[PDB]
RNA sequence: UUGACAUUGUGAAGAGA
RNA sequence: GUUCUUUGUAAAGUGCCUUCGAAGAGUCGAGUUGUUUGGGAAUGCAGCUCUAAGUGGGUGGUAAAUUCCAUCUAAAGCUAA
RNA sequence: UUGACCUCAAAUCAGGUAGGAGUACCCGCUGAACUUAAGCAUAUCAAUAAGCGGAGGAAAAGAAACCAACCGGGAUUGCCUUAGUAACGGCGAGUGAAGCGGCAAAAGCUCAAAUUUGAAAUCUGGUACCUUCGGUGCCCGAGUUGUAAUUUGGAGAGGG
């Protein structure tokens, strides 16, 4: 029933939820075999480091837009951009997106970068099995980190421009709202015409 | 567009050096198609028109073209969707007269 | 067909019996646009004995 | 190439022509069984696109299906029950024709399995259905690489499991915000949304 | 834990701490939120008042996210300087080489009027700022600069 | 049970505001 | 890690000019009915009825007309963790 | 008179395949009421139990007719969080996901529509012969109502 002063709580169990109960029991095991699972890849893969180069991307909305993410891959432009093909941009391990074109040149540049600096510090073995003994790095995306572009300096001096940052987002805005207004009171001012 | 690089107003957002991609096959799936537009072309009067295409036609060259809109937003199920039909068979209608 | 579309061809020999008649139908309207002298013929299978098999259409 | 004629010849079904096709083939296919083989697909283009070749071990076959509204098999009418599960009368089926001939005739060919299908003609009593079976015993199936995927046991009747072009219809898979429900699969994304998650250290 | 719970002591007393004449039954009053309106109304006015009802609009395919204004004031600011460098970017004072301070990417982006700070000038690097705090910003001689 | 729509094709007269 | 064969009177990669670039229908879409969904002038599903287009089409979570903009390419298919 | 063709039959024809069991998990169909609402019909129980069809070692989902509206992101699955939120709801009892972000794992792809047309280049079987998960030669069959190569939108083809 209802009784004392207590906030209205909302609990989903009157649906046999004793039925579906998931413990995690084997958060160990579901660890220590996630490990050897990874463990033995690096291994049967030989010096290769487990993962593929990632690209620089800049993430979404107006939230997350701030800091940079990786990516899925490293598109098109940017591939030939670092001069090779798509079909073997994938056999050196290298991610390849063939979706999410550039419409950003700071990114494109550091992209583009980011591959033949990732080109230089690989080493890429021949037909043959006759190769310098790979000592096997295992990681690649924290062997070629992402740092943060740096934007502003340190310290600068005052530009004071006499504009009130405020009333700009003021007029900024006050723009925005009245355009189709102001649209169509020039869309009845050219019926001016008799 | 060109980005005023401001928190908020019209054109707002962030200002970017400003590249532009080289565009996708996939943007154009209308394709105007040499044999595609030549091949319906011929097949659009081998079979003739349909019943109400038919009576969709008597509807424009008697009373009311408006009149022919209604039926067509019914017959077909759309009003965008109708009128690229209704126009069509204005030029159908130069089958014949103006030739 | 793509002779025709293309004006590489002169005679053409279109069979009566085939079923579905769309794989010629289209043809006869076809022809004449295209300017290629074609005949209705009889045997489907008599066409396709000059083509050394069971049966022909085209 | 004479199929792109064939296919937009087709595309215009109420046309002077086609009425005729149409009325000719509806009365011969009712005459015959309604689960029947047919020597050679009515649409060879058809057939085609949807991945039928003209190889030996492919196989079409023709069906019949009763056409509209699923009546409750309860006997007098009586459901026994709220009100609003009374509903007896206008009621539809959760799949499709289509996928009801699927099933029909991927059971008279056991040892075959369902690629897929195409409709042809329908009355008021009947929608009708070809069907592209792909025989996995067949070695030109089994050696042709494009294809041998289907003797794989993996895809055993997946017309029974909505497994066809039909069935991930039917059964709502697709990417986007319309298809929340049933894309992932259902059942198995109530379950998980349903499921209670307690770790070692509760959190 | 259990040997800590007053049901081991009422063990040997008849009818747990549960009263002889009222016992404990199963549901009295209904199970849950049963009867809000009628047997329980003097609860729900009094400690939930507003509960029944609509107010207001709706918003169909609401995200979170659209809204982002992690909210900062003058109240702080200087924070975002770290410690010993704060001291002698306050001790210079300058409006030849001051500080720069990036709000959005410190977390935030709007930044507000509370509170007073030193006459030391900032450069404020930010979006969505009230018109106090601006003002405020003028009288140590700093600008704000909005972005996005 | 009644109406509609669809199964639904081919024709002829003589009538309705 | 062995030594063969010679695959190559085959196959693949890459540059540049100009032209061309076929892309799935009783489907998509719609009406209505039922059901389902958090999906609300309708989230999906199916019945009957209507039934598209090719600078077209779908989506853009308030229905409609109009004007643009953004983003993907349905109605065929295979795949490890 | 004789020879093919289409369609359709038969055989204890030559070679095969389906059934049934299992059912913890998995893909679907079908489908409740007890119950909660302090009554009860919508609603809740529950898109659950029971009933039915089909699998595997995982199934399924998947290289977007996606998400977003950003400086944009980029197959799918799962964890963490979004979130008991947006929304649904005799707006009552109740119900209730998604986009972003962190992590686990990461993998991409092929057909159909194109004339080989200076050459069906494709393929099943039978057969001897061997080096037998098959290899060659020969032969009947398939197939032009389209088997091969080539191309899949990220393209790509013809020419130069
Ligand atoms: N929101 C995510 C979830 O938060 C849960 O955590 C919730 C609770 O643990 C925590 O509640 C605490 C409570 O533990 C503690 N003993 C008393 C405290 N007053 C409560 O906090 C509550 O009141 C405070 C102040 O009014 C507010 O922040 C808020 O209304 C609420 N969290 O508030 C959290 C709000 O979510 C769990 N960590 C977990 O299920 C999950 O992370
Ligand atoms: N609110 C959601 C979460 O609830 C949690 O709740 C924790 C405590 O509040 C809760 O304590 C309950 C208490 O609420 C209740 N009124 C009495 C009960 N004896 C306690 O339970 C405790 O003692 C029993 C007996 O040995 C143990 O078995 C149990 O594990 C222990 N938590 O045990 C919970 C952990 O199992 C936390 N407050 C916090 O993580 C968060 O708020
Ligand atoms: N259109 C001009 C250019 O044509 C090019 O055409 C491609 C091919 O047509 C071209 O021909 C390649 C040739 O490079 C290579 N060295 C020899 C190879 N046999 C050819 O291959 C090609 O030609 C044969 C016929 O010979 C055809 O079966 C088929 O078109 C293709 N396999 O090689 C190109 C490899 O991309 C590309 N589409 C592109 O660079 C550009 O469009
Ligand atoms: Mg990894
Ligand atoms: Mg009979
Ligand atoms: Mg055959
Ligand atoms: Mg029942
Ligand atoms: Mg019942
Ligand atoms: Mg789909
Ligand atoms: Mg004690
Ligand atoms: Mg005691
Ligand atoms: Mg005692
Ligand atoms: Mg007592
Ligand atoms: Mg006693
Ligand atoms: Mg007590
Ligand atoms: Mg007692
Ligand atoms: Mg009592
Ligand atoms: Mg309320
Ligand atoms: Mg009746
Ligand atoms: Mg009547
Ligand atoms: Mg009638
Ligand atoms: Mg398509
Ligand atoms: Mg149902
Ligand atoms: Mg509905
Ligand atoms: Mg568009
Ligand atoms: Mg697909
Ligand atoms: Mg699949
Ligand atoms: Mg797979
Ligand atoms: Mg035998
Ligand atoms: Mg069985
Ligand atoms: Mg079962
Ligand atoms: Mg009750
Ligand atoms: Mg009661
Ligand atoms: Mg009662
Ligand atoms: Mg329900
Ligand atoms: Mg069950
Ligand atoms: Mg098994
Ligand atoms: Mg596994
Ligand atoms: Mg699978
Ligand atoms: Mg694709
Ligand atoms: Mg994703
Ligand atoms: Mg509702
Ligand atoms: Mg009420
Ligand atoms: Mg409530
Ligand atoms: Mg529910
Ligand atoms: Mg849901
Ligand atoms: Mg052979
Ligand atoms: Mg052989």
Same mark, same amino acid.
């Given at each position: ?27 160990? @095991? ?42 899925? @891959? ?31 040149? =700071? ?21 043959? @099995?006759?190769?310098?003994?790979? =000592? ?25 421009? @006499? =504009? ?18 102001? =649209? ?11 | ?11 707002? &957002? ?33 079979? &003739? ?51 | ?58 | ?203 | ?148």
């Amino acid at each position: 029933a209802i009784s004392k002063n207590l906030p209205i709580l909302k609990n989903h169990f009157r649906k046999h939820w004793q039925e579906r109960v998931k413990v995690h029991f084997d958060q160990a @095991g579901k660890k220590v075999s996630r490990r050897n699972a990874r463990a033995t890849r690096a291994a049967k893969i030989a010096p290769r480091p487990l993962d593929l180069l990632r690209p620089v991307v800049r993430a979404p909305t107006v939230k997350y837009n701030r800091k940079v993410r990786a990516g899925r @891959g490293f598109t098109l432009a940017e591939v030939k951009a670092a001069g090779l093909t798509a079909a073997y941009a994938r056999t050196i391990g290298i991610a390849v997106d063939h979706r999410r074109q550039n419409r950003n040149q =700071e990114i494109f540049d550091a992209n583009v970068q980011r591959l033949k600096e990732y080109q230089s510090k690989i080493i890429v073995f021949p037909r043959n @099995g006759k190769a310098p003994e790979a =000592e096997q790095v295992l990681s690649a995306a924290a062997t070629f980190p992402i740092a943060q572009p740096a934007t502003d300096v340190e310290a600068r001096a005052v530009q004071d421009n @006499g =504009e009130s940052a405020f009333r700009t987002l003021r007029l900024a805005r006050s723009e925005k709202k009245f355009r189709g207004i102001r =649209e169509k009171r020039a869309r009845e001012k050219a019926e001016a015409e008799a | 567009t060109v980005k005023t690089g401001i928190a908020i107003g019209l054109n707002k &957002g962030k200002k970017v050096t400003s590249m532009t991609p080289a565009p996708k096959i996939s943007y154009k799936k209308g394709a105007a198609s040499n044999r595609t537009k030549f091949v319906r072309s011929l097949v659009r009067e081998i079979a &003739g028109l349909s019943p109400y295409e038919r009576r969709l036609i008597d509807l424009i060259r008697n009373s009311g073209e408006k009149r022919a809109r209604k039926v067509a937003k019914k017959r077909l199920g759309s009003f965008t969707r109708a009128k690229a039909k209704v126009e069509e068979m204005n030029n159908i209608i130069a089958a014949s007269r103006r030739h | 067909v793509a002779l025709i579309e293309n004006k590489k061809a002169k005679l053409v020999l279109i069979a009566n019996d085939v079923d579905p008649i769309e794989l010629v139908v289209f043809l006869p309207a076809l022809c004449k646009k295209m300017g290629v002298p074609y005949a209705i013929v009889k045997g489907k299978a008599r066409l396709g004995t000059l083509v050394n098999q069971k049966t022909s259409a085209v | 190439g004479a199929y792109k004629y064939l296919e937009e010849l087709q595309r215009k079904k109420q046309s002077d022509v086609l009425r005729f096709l149409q009325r000719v083939r509806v009365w011969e296919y009712r005459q015959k069984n309604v689960i029947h083989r047919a020597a050679r697909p009515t649409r060879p283009d058809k057939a085609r696109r949807l991945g039928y070749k003209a190889k030996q071990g492919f196989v079409i076959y023709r069906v019949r299906v009763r056409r509209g509204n699923r009546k409750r098999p309860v006997p007098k009418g009586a459901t026994y029950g709220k009100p609003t599960n009374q509903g007896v009368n206008e009621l539809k089926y959760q799949r499709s024709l289509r996928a009801t001939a699927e099933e029909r005739v991927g059971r008279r060919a056991a040892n075959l399995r369902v690629l897929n299908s195409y409709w042809v003609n329908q009355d008021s009593t009947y929608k009708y259905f070809e069907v592209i079976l792909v025989d996995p015993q067949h070695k030109a199936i089994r050696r042709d690489a494009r294809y041998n995927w289907i003797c794989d046991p993996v895809h055993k009747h997946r017309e029974a499991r909505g497994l066809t072009a039909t069935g991930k219809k039917s059964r709502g898979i697709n990417k986007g915000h319309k298809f929340n429900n049933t894309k992932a699969g259902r059942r198995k994304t109530w379950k998980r949304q349903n499921t209670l998650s307690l770790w070692r250290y509760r959190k | 834990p259990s040997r800590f719970t007053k049901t081991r002591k009422h063990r040997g007393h008849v009818s747990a701490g549960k009263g002889r004449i009222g016992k404990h039954r199963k549901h009295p009053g209904g199970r849950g939120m049963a009867g809000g309106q009628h047997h329980h109304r003097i609860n729900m006015d009094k400690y939930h008042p507003g509960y029944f009802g609509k107010v207001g609009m709706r918003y169909f395919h609401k995200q979170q996210a659209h809204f982002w204004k992690p909210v900062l004031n003058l109240d702080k600011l200087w924070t975002l300087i770290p410690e010993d460098k704060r001291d002698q970017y306050l001790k210079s004072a300058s409006k030849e080489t001051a500080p720069v301070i990036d709000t959005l990417a410190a977390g935030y982006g709007k930044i507000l009027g509370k509170g007073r700070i030193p006459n030391v000038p900032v450069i404020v690097k930010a979006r969505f700022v009230s018109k106090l705090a601006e003002e405020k910003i003028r009288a140590a001689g700093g600008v704000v600069e909005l972005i996005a």
